[PDB]
Amino acid sequence: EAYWNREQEKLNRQYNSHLNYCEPDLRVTSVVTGFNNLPDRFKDFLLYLRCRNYSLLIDQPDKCAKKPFLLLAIKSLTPHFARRQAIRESWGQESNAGNQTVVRVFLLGQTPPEDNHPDLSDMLKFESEKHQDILMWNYRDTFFNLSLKEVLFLRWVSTSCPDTEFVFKGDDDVFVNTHHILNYLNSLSKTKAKDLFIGDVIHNAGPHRDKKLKYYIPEVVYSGLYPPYAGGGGFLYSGHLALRLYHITDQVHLYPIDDVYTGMCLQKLGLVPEKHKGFRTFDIENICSYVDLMLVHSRKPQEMIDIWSQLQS
Amino acid sequence: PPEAYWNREQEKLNRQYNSHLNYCEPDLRVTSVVTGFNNLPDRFKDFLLYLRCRNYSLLIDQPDKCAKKPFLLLAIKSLTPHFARRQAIRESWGQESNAGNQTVVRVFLLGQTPPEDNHPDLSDMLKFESEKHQDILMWNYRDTFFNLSLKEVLFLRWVSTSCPDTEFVFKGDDDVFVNTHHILNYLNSLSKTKAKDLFIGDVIHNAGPHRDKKLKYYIPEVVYSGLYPPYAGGGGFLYSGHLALRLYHITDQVHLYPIDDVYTGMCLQKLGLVPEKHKGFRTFDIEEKNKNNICSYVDLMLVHSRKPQEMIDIWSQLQSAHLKC
Ligand SMILES: *[C@@H]1O[C@H](CO)[C@@H](O[C@@H]2O[C@H](CO)[C@@H](O[C@@H]3O[C@H](CO)[C@@H](O)[C@H](O[C@H]4O[C@H](CO)[C@@H](O)[C@H](O)[C@@H]4O)[C@@H]3O)[C@H](O)[C@H]2NC(C)=O)[C@H](O)[C@H]1NC(C)=O
Ligand SMILES: *[C@@H]1O[C@H](CO)[C@@H](O[C@@H]2O[C@H](CO)[C@@H](O[C@@H]3O[C@H](CO)[C@@H](O)[C@H](O[C@H]4O[C@H](CO)[C@@H](O)[C@H](O)[C@@H]4O)[C@@H]3O)[C@H](O)[C@H]2NC(C)=O)[C@H](O)[C@H]1NC(C)=O
Ligand SMILES: CC(=O)N[C@H]1[C@H](O[C@@H]2[C@@H](O)[C@H](O)O[C@H](CO)[C@@H]2O)O[C@H](CO)[C@@H](O[C@@H]2O[C@H](CO)[C@H](O)[C@H](O)[C@H]2O)[C@@H]1O
Ligand SMILES: CC(=O)N[C@H]1[C@H](O[C@@H]2[C@@H](O)[C@H](O)O[C@H](CO)[C@@H]2O)O[C@H](CO)[C@@H](O[C@@H]2O[C@H](CO)[C@H](O)[C@H](O)[C@H]2O)[C@@H]1O
Ligand SMILES: O=c1ccn([C@@H]2O[C@H](COP(=O)(O)OP(=O)(O)O)[C@@H](O)[C@H]2O)c(=O)[nH]1
Ligand SMILES: O=c1ccn([C@@H]2O[C@H](COP(=O)(O)OP(=O)(O)O)[C@@H](O)[C@H]2O)c(=O)[nH]1
Ligand SMILES: *[C@@H]1O[C@H](CO)[C@@H](O)[C@H](O)[C@H]1NC(C)=O
Ligand SMILES: *[C@@H]1O[C@H](CO)[C@@H](O)[C@H](O)[C@H]1NC(C)=O
Ligand SMILES: *[C@@H]1O[C@H](CO)[C@@H](O)[C@H](O)[C@H]1NC(C)=O
Ligand SMILES: [Mg+2]
Ligand SMILES: [Mg+2]
């Protein structure tokens, strides 16, 4: 009865246009109960659900010219200049130690004037030319379009970085202990590494029905429970799985919560992401508190540099 | 009954006028004369050790900013990383203009954000921004909360040196919405007498220092004793350029204070003046229920606090607000 569930079931029957239909899908105004009274973000989500063929405005095509051991992929918005630079100087440094290459990309969409964003296009061009780590696509960068940010990033992995051994995807305000991540990745068996997917995995979750939370999903949009999913603050997976995940995205309708969407894709593949206790996407309760952690949400740019500096000793 | 350290040093200054300005070595005396110095937070140690130093130089100047005599100079406190805040101001209420040959010009007021304070290095982008927009003033001191009174004194020096003929000054924060049209209408309503010593804002009377160690405005009893003079909250206040010159001259006679808007109130009190409350300055915001009605902003001078998109949104709706409301 909920809209997403019914359309997804239609998709299941077709695989057992929803991909490049980019006119407004006016059907939703008649088939979604109370559509006129939905918040604008749901109107936009429903009207443009069947469009995901957006193009790269800023690419870094040689980012993976040397096959990486680890790709860091960080969700960011144009105005977050200090967040990105703190990451570059702390846990997101690119490196080649042990010939285990780490490369870094930030994942951006457009911040257009119609959404009341200041025009930062000249600063973003300066930054992209200076640091060569900005990927930017021509879609409206919004909270409910983070699942678009996920799908287009996975597409970019498939086209431009398909041979990375591992992928870390996360937020631009989480602290990551990249040394611990690399140590963990190097201790993996070959079998465990082929389909690795770990994070702060949430089981038996359901959609928030509370209208004051940013995660609110109306009953007319989605019914039932969520699959197991790793919290989007940051998760870690094999590049092999990144390609299998990209292939399966066509068979899963976009969903307004992006980390739930990745969990939906894993489930369709027959996989279950595994919890690693070092991923603290809901923060901690002292620099020694951070020694054994993989990730902590959330930290400001100065805090990111401070923690990283103290951890090096 | 010995006063607190700031009061005692201010008493010494008062008697000297009825070095504290370019002594930039650490004043190790404070470790002996400030009660409990060793147990103070680092920000108080730094403030006390370097209290007598304020001859910092401009690294980035805009020397022709006031080549055309302004009617109103907008001076906005900002920090290096705040690119989106500054651009939103440029496009909304901080636009430069010449309507009615009443020139409005804009500067942002910055210090350094050094790597030793764990700041990411954004210096090349700031230099690019300055080259593009020609509205960055930057001095070579450590930009911190407790150095904002330094930001105030160095800005007033720049007005005396480089913009002394501006008719009015608005000084405010980079996270406030300002109804600049209402400000200009108000300034054009003033008698010549009221305008000569104009100083208005969200004026707080009978305030004292916060003694709760958990608040960012905390001030220890060993640092400052007694009450605060009347003062306009720093989110933004409005005053004459004539008074800006009088305020600059008097800064030499008032020791820096960790809270910048209290410092400005101290300087006004030394001038024999009392800032006046204007109800349109909402430095503690407006009612939660009226935040999404643009008519709520028509009669306001200033609202704290708003994000870059919110400032642009409010400004855009305000340009057609005369059609409703
Ligand atoms: C995720 O990103 C996608 C891609 O950027 C984004 O899709 C875009 O949404 C906007 C609406 O938010 C669409 O813009 C509309 O296009 C139609 C074309 O006919 C216009 O008629 C619409 O007019 C509206 O706005 C007018 C004023 O400008 C009003 O007068 C009028 O009444 C309408 O309200 C409107 O401009 C745009 O076409 C798509 N672009 C695509 C599909 O490529 C989507 O919104 C984002 N999703 C979320 C959840 O944020
Ligand atoms: C307001 O701005 C002023 C001007 O920027 C700023 O003054 C500066 O303060 C810093 C301290 O925070 C001073 O730097 C110190 O200088 C002394 C020598 O005079 C050094 O011994 C200090 O070394 C420290 O760090 C070393 C390495 O970690 C340690 O080994 C050592 O023990 C110290 O911890 C440090 O370099 C600087 O000299 C002044 N500059 C000037 C021009 O006065 C002031 O701090 C700001 N005030 C506030 C309240 O923020
Ligand atoms: C089972 C679970 O953990 N579900 C969500 C969790 O609900 C909490 C309840 O289990 C608990 O009893 O009460 C608290 C109230 O204090 C919570 O309601 O809440 C978290 C935080 O919202 C959810 O994780 C988040 O889910 C959203 C999507 O709704 C999104 O995926 C986000 O990234 C993730 O952090 C749990 O799913
Ligand atoms: C007289 C006054 O307003 N004093 C400060 C005010 O104190 C409030 C108390 O009067 C009341 O009993 O409790 C409330 C808390 O619910 C307040 O504590 O608090 C405001 C907010 O801090 C102060 O304004 C701020 O002062 C700091 C310096 O201390 C700084 O100048 C800042 O710009 C300003 O907004 C009142 O001074
Ligand atoms: O339109 C958006 C909104 C958010 N983000 C990024 O998504 C991540 C999560 O945002 P937020 O902190 O608001 O979400 P929460 O952690 O509260 O779920 C952050 O890295 C944001 O920079 C984004 O890229 N585009
Ligand atoms: O080290 C600093 C800290 C703050 N600010 C500016 O001072 C103003 C007030 O900052 P904040 O909002 O944190 O203070 P609050 O309103 O909470 O008293 C804003 O314009 C900041 O950009 C600054 O210039 N340097
Ligand atoms: C997606 O593809 C269709 C044609 O197949 C095209 O009309 C549409 O403009 C494309 N969408 C975008 C955003 O380019
Ligand atoms: C201020 O002046 C004194 C000498 O006049 C000098 O030693 C000191 O370094 C100056 N301070 C700064 C920050 O230039
Ligand atoms: C316009 O303003 C300037 C000061 O900014 C003044 O010198 C000039 O005389 C004015 N011109 C007119 C037309 O009054
Ligand atoms: Mg977050
Ligand atoms: Mg503020």
Kindly report the three-state secondary structure assignment for every residue of B166-223.
CCEEEEEECCEEECHHHHHHHHHCCCHHHHHCCEEECEECCCCCECCCCCCCECCCCC
Kindly list the residues from chain A whose CB atom is less than 8 angstroms away from the CB atom of residue B312.
116-118
- Ligand 7 is surrounded, with C-beta below 6 A, by A 20, 22, 51, 53-54
Three-state secondary-structure class, residue B140: strand
Q: Cβ of A81 and B125 within 8 Å?
A: yes
Can you tell me which atom of ligand 2 is nearest the CA of B43? Answer: 49
Report if residue A68 sits inside a domain. yes
Residues of chain B contacting A123 with CB distance shorter than 8 Å = 83, 87, 125, 128-129
Q: Give the residues surrounding ligand 1 with Cβ less than 6 Å away.
A: A 22, 41, 44-45, 48, 51, 139-140, 142, 144-145, 148
| Chain B positions in Cβ-Cβ contact with residue A302 (cut-off 8 Å) | 117-119
B252 found inside a domain: yes
3-state secondary structure chain A: CCHHHHHHHHHHHHHCCCCECCCCCCCHHHHCCCHHHCCHHHHHHHHCCCECCCCEEECCCCCCCCCCCEEEEEECCCCCHHHHHHHHHCCCCCECHHHCCEEEEEEEEECCHHHCCCCCHHHHHHHHHHHCCEEEEEEECCHHHHHHHHHHHHHHHHHHCCCCCEEEEEECCEEECHHHHHHHHHCCCHHHHHCCEEECEECCCCCECCCCCCCECCCCCCCCCCCCEECCCEEEEEHHHHHHHHHHHCCCCCCCCHHHHHHHHHHHCCCCCEECCCEECCCCCCHHHHCCCCEEECCCHHHHHHHHHHHCC
Number of domains composing chain A: 1
Binding site membership of B19 for ligand 8 (Cβ less than 6 Å) = no
Beta carbon of A141 within 6 Å of any ligand 5 atom: yes
Residue A209 forms part of a structural domain: yes
Residue B79 in domain: yes
Helices and strands (H, E) in chain B, number of each type: 12, 13
User: Chain B within 8 Å of A306 (Cβ-Cβ)?
Assistant: yes
Domain assignment of residue A180, given as a range: 56-313
Report the C-alpha gap between B298 and B212 in whole angstroms.
Answer: 37
CB pairs under 8 A between A and B: 68
User: Are the C-beta atoms of B311 and B291 separated by less than 8 Å?
Assistant: no
**Resolution expressed in Å:** 1.9
Cβ of residue A258 lying under 6 Å from some atom of ligand 5: no
Q: Do B313 and A116 touch (CB under 8 A)?
A: yes
Strands A174-176 and A102-110: unpaired
CB B35 within 8 A of CB B138: no
Question: Is residue A14 situated within a structural domain?
Answer: no
Residues 6+ apart with CB under 8 A from A22: A48, A50, A51, A53
The answer to whether residue B50 sits within a structural domain is no
Place of tokens 């090349």: B124
Using a CB–CB cutoff of 8 Å, tell me whether B145 touches chain A. no
Q: Within an 8 Å CB–CB cutoff, is residue A89 touching chain B?
A: yes
Ligand 6 atom at minimal distance to the Cα of residue B283: 16
In a domain, A167, yes or no: yes
Chain A residue with the nearest C-alpha to that of B121:
A85
Residue of A nearest to B79 (CA): A82
- Residue A123 forms contact with B (CB below 8 Å): yes
Q: Which value, in Å, is the radius of gyration of the alpha carbons in chain B? A: 20
In a domain, A138, yes or no: yes
CATH label of the domain that carries residue B307? 3.90.550.50
